[PDB]
């Protein structure tokens, strides 16, 4: 069975990028603003069985906010995002938190400082204290480098299942088929070969 997770935070903080990374493995470099909310199921395999999060990825831009706190109703957990390269996004964390807890009074909440991969960090580790009095879990994360990318979901899963020893485990690997439409046409391959792979300077 499943849990409703609401993801909130300022526009541009990386909420959608973070979710997409988890959903497909990709890193979206473009900023395409979320309109209202986008709902995505997301399943993790754990030692206590599969856990499904229904992720309500909300809009951070005021202009695109849609139902706003209407999205929070019956949320069972939440992630509040900010961007460690933008002080204003941390300044706004108490506002997101206020709106969230007014609807969801006793849920586990992770606070995430995203974009820790960027060299010129503006919101320093020592500045980040809002979580303490609000009993929020905090993680430095990067959707780009994947630093701590699993931690918010692991912590929430542990809280929601009520098992501190819960761990992710390798999902079952069913045997794959054999597939030998004999004259199928794949000029598609030449396009793929002649389109450069991104981030060729990365380590990998």
Which of 64, 56, 60 has the alpha carbon at shortest distance from 9?
A: 60
- Encoded one letter per residue, x for contact with ligand GNP by CB under 6 A and - for no contact, window 43-62 reads ----------------xxx-
Which of 62, 55, 65 has the alpha carbon at shortest distance from 21?
A: 55
- Encoded one letter per residue, x for contact with ligand GNP by CB under 6 A and - for no contact, window 137-156 reads -----xxx------------
Which is nearer to Mg ion, 35 or 73 (by Cβ)?
35
Q: Distance between CA 11 and CA 34 in Å, rounded?
A: 9
Residues facing 139 on adjacent strands: 112
List residues binding Mg ion (CB under 5 A): 15-16, 34
Runs of H (alpha helix) within 31-140: 87-91, 93-103, 130-134
Tell whether residue 114 is a contact of ligand GNP (CB under 6 A): yes
At closest approach, how far in Å is the CB of 201 from ligand GNP? 14
- Compute the residue count for the chain: 204
Residues facing 78 on adjacent strands: 6, 109
Q: Are 143 and 26 in contact (CB under 8 A)?
A: no
At closest approach, how far in Å is the CB of 162 from ligand GNP? 30
Tell whether residue 87 is a contact of Cl ion (CB under 5 A): yes
Binding region for ligand GNP (CB under 6 A): 9, 11-17, 28-31, 33-34, 59-61, 114-115, 117-118, 142-144
Residues annotated within a binding site for GTP = 10-17, 28-34, 60, 114-117, 142-144
Binding region for Cl ion (CB under 5 A): 86-87, 122
């Amino acid at each position: 069975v499943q849990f409703k997770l609401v993801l909130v935070g300022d526009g541009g903080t990386g909420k959608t990028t973070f979710v997409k990374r988890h959903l497909t493995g990709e890193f979206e470099k473009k900023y395409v603003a979320t309109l209202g909310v986008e709902v995505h199921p997301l399943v993790f395999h754990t030692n206590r069985g599969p856990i499904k999060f229904n992720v309500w990825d909300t809009a951070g831009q005021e202009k695109f906010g849609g139902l706003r706190d209407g999205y929070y109703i019956q949320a069972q957990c939440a992630i509040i995002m900010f961007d460690v390269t933008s002080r204003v996004t941390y300044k706004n964390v108490p506002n997101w938190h206020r709106d969230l807890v007014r609807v969801c009074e006793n849920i586990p909440i992770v606070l995430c400082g995203n974009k820790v991969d960027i060299k010129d960090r503006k919101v320093k580790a020592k500045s980040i204290v809002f979580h303490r009095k609000k009993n929020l879990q905090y993680y430095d994360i990067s959707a780009k480098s994947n630093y701590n990318f699993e931690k918010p979901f692991l912590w929430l899963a542990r809280k929601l299942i009520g098992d501190p020893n819960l761990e992710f485990v390798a999902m079952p690997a069913l045997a794959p088929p054999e597939v030998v439409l004999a004259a199928q046409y794949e000029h598609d391959l030449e396009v793929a070969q002649t389109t450069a792979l991104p981030d060729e300077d990365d380590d990998l």
